[PDB]
Amino acid sequence: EEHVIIQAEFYLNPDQSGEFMFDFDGDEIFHVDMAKKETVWRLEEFGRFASFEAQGALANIAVDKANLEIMTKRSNYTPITNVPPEVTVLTNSPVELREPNVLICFIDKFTPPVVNVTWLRNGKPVTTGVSETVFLPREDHLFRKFHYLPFLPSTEDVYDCRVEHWGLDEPLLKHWEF
Amino acid sequence: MGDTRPRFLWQLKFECHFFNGTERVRLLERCIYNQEESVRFDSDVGEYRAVTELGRPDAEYWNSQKDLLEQRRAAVDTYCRHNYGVGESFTVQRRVEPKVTVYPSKTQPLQHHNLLVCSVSGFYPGSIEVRWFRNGQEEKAGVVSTGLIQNGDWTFQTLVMLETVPRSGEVYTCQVEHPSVTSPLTVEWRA
Amino acid sequence: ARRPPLAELAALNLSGSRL
């Protein structure tokens, strides 16, 4: 019985975007929301068992930003090389007509951690009930991300997860059908 | 995304590795610039080491501060063991039982089904064994799987597929052992 | 905050800084 707990942070320029999170065997325990300055548990029930003071994570993001600036200069302004994502679409559970299910767009092996993701039903954007994870760390120091779409399976609708990323030449469209 | 200015990325990773509860614990700290680790602390060593040339100044600076090193060396207790103790009940001890369903499928359009799919979904932890049986005898030929799929929400799924030519009267069983249950889950399919 | 806290490890400044 091996286990691993990882505290993972990043800061990216020039986007000025940061993340702070804890990972247990590949799942997210919590992240800190930067704009609200607040601990966001991945599952609500975790907040019944443990706390986390977000202030310390904000203090770490400030150091990370400064350090990014030092390193950027020390490297002679070497920028990151884009690695485009691998995308898979699947469901939660076995698909049955008219039974609630969830489509998962799984976006993997990419960097930097900026990606544009749209759910399409029959070619048109859907926002109803969508949600997404923060960026999860990989051992190769690339990123993993999940986007979710609750849906009613039918023979009238097809779906696409549309992913754009700097490493891709054109948007990447992953198709799903009953 | 029309903004194609160069990106510069910093990451930090503090990893607590646990073997046999907290009996053996190893802390690894990593600083990563872009996609490249620059400097590391490993609690088996107890000082920083440069992973690449760019990390050398940091290793030297930090290792000059024995007060700082002492604190990192103590973190195996004050950080790794402490967090394990806090998180154990809802991470290490989390158990969610698999939902098991079996349905037939086809390798290509065909008049008859020639695949039995064993769907095992919604479970935690990821450790699982899924076996196919025909009339009480384990089938090892003709079996392919997705492997273990992380859902992102502290559940896993897998599909385990058996290519076969069913004959009526035959009973196929999908058998699942997972830490959440003390005896196997089984779902039977009659052809 | 009644529940036992998860503790972060603090980030260190690199060689070449101040703040």
Numbering used by the authors:
A (entry chain A): 3 to 180
B (entry chain B): 0 to 190
C (entry chain C): 2 to 20
Text from the published report:
We did, however, determine the crystal structure of HLA-DR1 in complex with the full-length 5T4111–130 20-mer peptide at 1.95 Å resolution. 5T4111–130 bound via a near-typical HLA-DR1 binding motif incorporating Leu-1, Leu-4, Ala-6, and Leu-9 at P1, P4, P6, and P9 as anchor residues, respectively. In addition, unbiased omit map analysis provided no evidence of partial occupancy that may result due to register shifting of the epitope. This therefore defined the core nonamer-binding region of the immunogenic peptide as 5T4117–125 (FARRPPLAELAALNLSGSRL; underlined) flanked by six N-terminal PFRs, henceforth N-PFRs (FARRPP) and five C-terminal PFRs, henceforth C-PFRs (SGSRL). Deterioration of electron density at the N and C termini caused an increase in assigned isotropic displacement B-factors within the three most N-terminal residues (FARRPP-) and two most C-terminal residues (-SGSRL), suggesting that these PFR regions exhibit high flexibility. As a result, the N-terminal Phe-(−6) residue could not be modeled due to a lack of discernible continuous electron density. Interestingly, we observed contrasting features at each terminus, whereby the N-PFR largely nestled along the -DRα chain, whereas the C-PFR elevated away from the HLA. N-PFRs made nearly 3-fold more contacts with the HLA compared with the C-PFRs. This was mediated by two consecutive prolines (Pro-(−1) and Pro-(−2)), which incorporated a di-proline kink that positioned the N-PFR adjacent to the α2 domain of the peptide-binding groove. Interestingly, despite being outside the core-binding region, Arg-(−3) displayed the largest number of inter-molecular contacts out of any other peptide residue by contacting five consecutive -DRα residues: Gly-49α–Ser-53α. Instead, the C-PFRs formed a hairpin loop structure mediated primarily by intramolecular (peptide to peptide) contacts; causing the protrusion of the peptide away from the HLA binding groove's influence and back to the core peptide region.
